[PDB]
Amino acid sequence: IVKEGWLHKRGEYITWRPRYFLLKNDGTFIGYKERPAPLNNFSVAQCQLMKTERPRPNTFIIRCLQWTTVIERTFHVETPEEREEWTTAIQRVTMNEFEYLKLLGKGTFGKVILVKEKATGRYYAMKILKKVLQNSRHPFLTALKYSFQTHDRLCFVMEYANGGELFFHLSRERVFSEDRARFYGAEIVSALDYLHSEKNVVYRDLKLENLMLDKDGHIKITDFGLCPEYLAPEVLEDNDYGRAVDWWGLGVVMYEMMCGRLPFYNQDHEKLFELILMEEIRFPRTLGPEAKSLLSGLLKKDPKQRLGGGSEDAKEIMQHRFFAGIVWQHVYEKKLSPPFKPQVTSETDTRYF
Ligand SMILES: Nc1ncccc1-c1nc2ccc(-c3ccccc3)nc2n1-c1ccc(C2(N)CCC2)cc1
């Protein structure tokens, strides 16, 4: 522990709340609602500090590039010498190689472009951020093929699955069978397991929009971050959070696969946030009891009690009844037989673009 004490923190989602922070020698910087393994999401490594006076004097900002995504946390103290304490405490290929084809996403920090590589014909996604790295040896995360820089832009070329978005395949079919969900669920769990233990990283945005299928119908987890129905309670009320957020997410995604609908819904965001924090779930009668058990545990409102939420993390999901007779090393080596294969001949079949 290098320094500690109250700071004001801006509510990343639904404004300012005091919170007791702990900077540490490992890099970590975390805030608890009262005076109280490590995750690289909360680290200060290669971050960039910014004193400022908008929209409240003695404000400061930590901005970090984590992997291919820019992260901002904003704080505010009572006096400038105080802000200053904390501050000090805290401190080839080029664009010509590709065709630009479709705008996959815009946002504040940059753009994501569907791109064909001229020298091979193969399609990737290019993340371009307005102004070293070892990949994850795991097949269902999004791999980074090329990273390069121009004079005003940071460029990241990464896999882009050509098998369709899982949100579309579901919109079409309305609902998934309990065993198709099991297939998707197991790949996701393997992927998040890898991230949690091999990287000490949480994904935080597990939702349907962030899952696609490759040529073979296997899962790909997206890395296209540029900037409610899926937010964990813990995240709403703006606590310390951890690896369990991804399991809350996994429950929501699985709930919607197997019930063809969202576990909590409402047009008004404030009554949605109420529901997330207060309503227990009415599960369908049309639904297997091992499934019910998985979802109930994945969707527990207290992260410490949630399934996957203990010291064992993902091992607690992997050995649930619902996942009986899944060989996990099989999953990792893509040895499961996808139920759905999308309409696609080659890696390059633009049918789904
Ligand atoms: N490449 C991958 N493809 C598929 C899912 C996740 C990743 C992925 N790989 C990583 C590797 C490292 C790191 C990292 C995290 C914090 C601090 C430093 C590094 N992050 C990685 N992520 C990864 C990607 C996106 C996120 C967000 N959705 C954007 C903020 C949440 C989080 C984590």
State whether the beta carbon of 204 lies less than 6 angstroms from ligand 1: yes
Please state, as a whole number, how many other Cβ atoms lie within 10 Å of the Cβ of residue 106. Answer: 11
Active-site hit among 26, 179, 193, 205: 205
Solved using: X-ray
| CA distance linking residue 11 with residue 93, whole number of Å | 39
**Any known ligand binding at 58?**
no
**Any known ligand binding at 105?**
yes
The DSSP letter of residue 334 is T
State whether the beta carbon of 223 lies less than 6 angstroms from ligand 1: yes
| 219: nearest Cα among 170, 164, 178, 260 | 164
Q: Just give the CATH number of 165-353.
A: 1.10.510.10
- Which long-range contacts link 14-19 to residues 24+ away (Cβ below 8 Å)? 14/228, 14/236, 14/269, 14/270, 14/273, 16/56, 16/76, 17/238, 19/238
Distance 280 CA to ligand 1 centre (A): 31
How does 332-350 read in b/e, with b if 16+ C-beta sit within 10 Å? bebebebebebebeeeeee
* CATH 3.30.200.20 location in the chain: 92-164
Distance 223 CA to ligand 1 centre (A): 7
* CATH 2.30.29.30 location in the chain: 1-91
Q: Just give the CATH number of 92-164.
A: 3.30.200.20
Helix (H, G, I), strand (E, B) or coil at 121: coil
Count of CA atoms in the C-beta half-sphere (13 A) of 27: 13
Tell me which residue has its CA closest to atom 27 in ligand 1: 203
Q: Which phi and psi (to 5°) does residue 198 adopt? A: -75, -25
State whether the beta carbon of 205 lies less than 6 angstroms from ligand 1: yes
**Sign of the dihedral defined by the CA atoms of residues 12, 14, 18, 22, in that order:** negative
| 140: nearest Cα among 103, 208, 202, 192 | 192
State whether the beta carbon of 342 lies less than 6 angstroms from ligand 1: no
* CATH 1.10.510.10 location in the chain: 165-353
Distance 41 CA to ligand 1 centre (A): 9
Report CA Rg, the chain.
21
| CA distance linking residue 218 with residue 139, whole number of Å | 9
Angle, vertex CA 134, rays to CA 130 and CA 137, nearest 5: 120
Pairing, β 153-159 against β 211-213: unpaired
Distance 287 CA to ligand 1 centre (A): 33
Q: Is 205 a catalytic residue?
A: yes
User: What Å resolution does this PDB entry report?
Assistant: 2.7
- Give start and end residues of each alpha helix (H) in the chain: 80-90, 166-173, 178-199, 233-236, 244-259, 269-278, 289-298, 315-318, 328-332
| CA distance linking residue 246 with residue 244, whole number of Å | 5
| CA distance linking residue 331 with residue 187, whole number of Å | 6
52 bridge partner residues: 59
Structure tokens at 28: 């970590």
Helix (H, G, I), strand (E, B) or coil at 126: strand
Tell me which residue has its CA closest to atom 12 in ligand 1: 67
Helix (H, G, I), strand (E, B) or coil at 133: coil
Q: How far is CA 345 from the centre of its chain?
A: 30
State whether the beta carbon of 70 lies less than 6 angstroms from ligand 1: no
CA of 205, closest atom in ligand 1:
28
| CA distance linking residue 271 with residue 128, whole number of Å | 36
State whether the beta carbon of 125 lies less than 6 angstroms from ligand 1: no
**Topology adopted by domain 1-91:** PH-domain like (2.30.29)
Distance 282 CA to ligand 1 centre (A): 33
